[PDB]
Design a protein. Structure first.
Lengths: 95, 97, 109, 83, 83, 97, 95, 95, 109, 83
DNA sequence: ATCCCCTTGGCGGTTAAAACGCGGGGGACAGCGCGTACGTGCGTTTAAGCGGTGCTAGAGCTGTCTACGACCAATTGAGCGGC
DNA sequence: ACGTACGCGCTGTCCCCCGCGTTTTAACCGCCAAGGGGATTACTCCCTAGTCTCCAGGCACGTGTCAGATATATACATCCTGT
């Protein structure tokens, strides 16, 4: 008997095949991507919590992360991310 | 003959007096104008607390004090009493910019 | 009697899981309320990040003509970009080594 | 209305006093322009964070509260104005 | 069971190869022992923190998760072992 | 006579060979002995997972090679190619430890 | 009137008179001390959160925060703080 | 009222509000965009018809337009176009 | 008891119509039958091209410190881009003029 | 199986004979390189198109019919191979 | 929706802020060797690496239970506002 | 163990910067109008957490297979050597 350990397996595999169908994966690289997504997630999450404390809002909306991604993410990366999330949330509200 | 001090002695007197000094070392109003200048480079018609001008003033001067104490460490490592810009550049590189 | 199941990722057209990140923000204990656009926004941000870095890593793997990505490809991918360098200056990569960085004085002549 | 040079208002003698605090005893002329440059870089980063706070605060006047918040985020936490 | 002299376990050619990866051409003789010392104090911090994590867990075996976690709270996060 | 390369180009060959390589330059067994020894210096009879020893090995690997690239920056600051341990003490001080 | 804006003025004044009855206090120094209280408190609270989630603990106890003190506070300051907190919690449990 | 002269009006304004919220649109620039969409649609539809006749196919699905995008649009834009078109058809299959 | 009329463009997550593009493919007389991927794919490539060229148009307008897009900005935006130029070599923009492309020897010394 | 550099298989006197059909009296030695380069460019375009045609048709052998289709697309319509 | 207050806007006197020139005078730095010290080329050895074997410590999961602590209405009091 | 190479001590040598010193000018000081926004308060709506139920994608497991791990023979790069 084994307990399942959660990871970011199929999502990184699918996004790689969406960007490069003919490029393979090694498992140590897969661990590096697991640690990357966990690290950046906790960075944004902690910054969002600090903003919620800071403006005394009891909530984290899309606007808090919008603020947080010009906080941590730089510039063109941040503005492309803002655009991606903006179109994502418009598709989400349309669905 | 009018009396004149040797170079560095007035400099070291300034060192001792202004490590002894605790006040703000920058003129207030041009710093306020500069932070407003950078503000309208970002958002239009934006306003500041005077306390915020104080806060950026004291943070800016202390941050610069950090860069320059790193600059002395680099310069004595470079065996120079006259610093150069490359000292500050290397300090920015090592500090984790 | 019941609506058919559609994931929020398919509603947003993302393939990172919106529900997983929403759970992990609930149980990451960052606020007692979270706006609904927040986790899908964050998942889209990581989607852009992972897509960017997998473009870079796949391109590097083609440049060293290897079919499978390796942490060396990842470490070249991060370190050959400026804004990812600022994003991950303080990050250690296992078996990624170091970017090829020789100073000009280390060269002969 | 608009202003085009107040970077020089942090003057050459003012930069001289600032380096006198750091213990710097001889300063060539080439240092000062790069010091105002990195002053612009740091304060640009801080005020970017600050206006991002401020626009997120849905206000139009910057307080020292978001200033010390941004100094906390950048890693140069300031004592004296918290709370 | 007791070990005495594992500072010399990190051999001089290992140190030279380390500095090869860091791009050092020439390595003077005084470097090896004090680099052993600074590796020692770095592991004193990291292992003290990680072992403190373990004894917080009421575990007896040090895990890689605690090594990367004690790394990460020192601003030295590592990728590749469950972080 | 057997062929002999000049002092330095074998070192640069080792350089180029090792940024093209990824392999962990520290021997596994004495590193595991060292981590058990340092841990035994604090708390007794302490066991290490092999994954923990390996993970700490690339950790220490990256920490020191960051320190050596930083001291190479300090050396080209000091007009030098052979680093000396005051470069490392400088790097420790201006990094802030 | 105004809403009550909270600060650590009185208690630092209390410990001030406790350890130096003859000395005075300034407003700038008091703001520095309030920022110090806030800074050290938030560092320990953040590390206590990390210890809570690394062990999947839903609570932060004296063991959790005690460990966090050994992490944050160095050396003899750490063990003196352990001694003070242990004496304090034994006095607290003595009611 | 008169008969409706169909155009791409609201679509160009909403895609601009996605990509640049603050800038405005002139009627001349809007006519340029209408004639651009007319030209590119005409080119791709005509080449799709060409591939329909050429492979003796009465059917034109996304695969022939992927063929046509690989034909007409050069390189970088071609693979970009294939990427978001593949994302679009996958969200179409997922409805 | 009919389902709510929800749009195929939002099913694509897009803005250029599946409906209008499918209608002009059917009534443009290009094939007897048209697959469902055809109008969504072609609307997607038009939306990509439109977003790219209005990105360059907006940057061109802000470079000229102006707010509203003009065909001068459009023509400038087209012939800064090599693959757009190769796409639109034989097309003339109304009121766009010519981007400054001055050959060197006719410039004064 | 794999080849590297057969582009000189279109020999220089072949290019000379081509220019004699093109009515060029004097062909510089510099000329042959960009003729090979533009021939590479044109064939790269044509074979890209033709490969796209064949891969659309789910085949593995290029027909001349697909070649003349590629010449229809790019605007160099050729007569005499079943177009 | 408001209110009221600290910033914004404008005004008058002054002297330090600065600022620029003169002049002294302190400084970086190439470089020419010299001291020397690792760098590199080998040989030697030995212990790490590799492969195989037996033990069991404790990691981790499961069940039990109970130790522990937010909530809430309420009472009150000590610190916040104000002078 | 041979040996080239690096660290550098000192010292001229241009050379740039500190310091004094008068002048000029704009912040400092101190002084008034005011209003816009910071900040506070009532409302009612936006929004999200949370349970029950149900399903469906995502991870453990196995495996089997071709990209890669390993092996062997030339070509050139390089790096010293020789005229």
């Amino acid at each position: 008997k084994r307990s399942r350990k959660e990871s970011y397996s199929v999502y990184v595999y699918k996004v790689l095949k969406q960007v490069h169908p003919d490029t393979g994966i090694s498992s140590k690289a897969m661990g590096i991507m697991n640690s990357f997504v966990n690290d950046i997630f906790e960075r944004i999450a902690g910054e969002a919590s600090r903003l919620a404390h800071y403006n005394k809002r009891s909530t984290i909306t899309s606007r808090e992360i919008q603020t947080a991604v010009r906080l941590l993410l730089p510039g063109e990366l941040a503005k492309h991310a803002v655009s991606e999330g903006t179109k994502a949330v418009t598709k989400y509200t349309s669905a | 003959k009018p009396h004149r001090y040797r170079p560095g002695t007035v400099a070291l007197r300034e060192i001792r007096r202004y490590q002894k000094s605790t006040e703000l070392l920058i003129r207030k109003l041009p710093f306020q104008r500069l932070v407003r200048e950078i503000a309208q480079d970002f958002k239009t018609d934006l306003r500041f607390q005077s306390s915020a001008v104080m806060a950026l003033q004291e943070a800016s001067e202390a941050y610069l004090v950090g860069l320059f104490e790193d600059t002395n460490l680099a310069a004595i490592h470079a065996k120079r009493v006259t610093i150069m810009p490359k000292d500050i550049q290397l300090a920015r590189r090592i500090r984790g910019e | 009697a019941r609506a058919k199941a559609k994931t929020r990722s398919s509603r947003a057209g993302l393939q990172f899981p919106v529900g997983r990140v929403h759970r992990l923000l609930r149980k990451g204990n960052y606020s007692e309320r979270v706006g609904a656009g927040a986790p899908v926004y964050l998942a889209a941000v990581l989607e852009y990040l992972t897509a960017e870095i997998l473009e870079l890593a796949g391109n590097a793997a083609r440049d060293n003509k290897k079919t499978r990505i390796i942490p060396r490809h990842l470490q070249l991918a991060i370190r050959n970009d400026e804004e990812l360098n600022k994003l991950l200056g303080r990050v250690t990569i296992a078996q990624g080594g170091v970017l090829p960085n020789i100073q000009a004085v280390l060269l002969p002549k | 209305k608009v202003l085009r040079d107040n970077i020089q208002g942090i003057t050459k003698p003012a930069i001289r006093r600032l380096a006198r605090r750091g213990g710097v005893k001889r300063i060539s002329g080439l240092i000062y322009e790069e010091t105002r440059g990195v002053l612009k870089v740091f304060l640009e980063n801080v005020i970017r964070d600050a206006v991002t706070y401020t626009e997120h605060a849905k206000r139009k006047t910057v307080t020292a509260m978001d200033v010390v918040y941004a100094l906390k985020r950048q890693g140069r936490t300031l004592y004296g104005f918290g709370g």
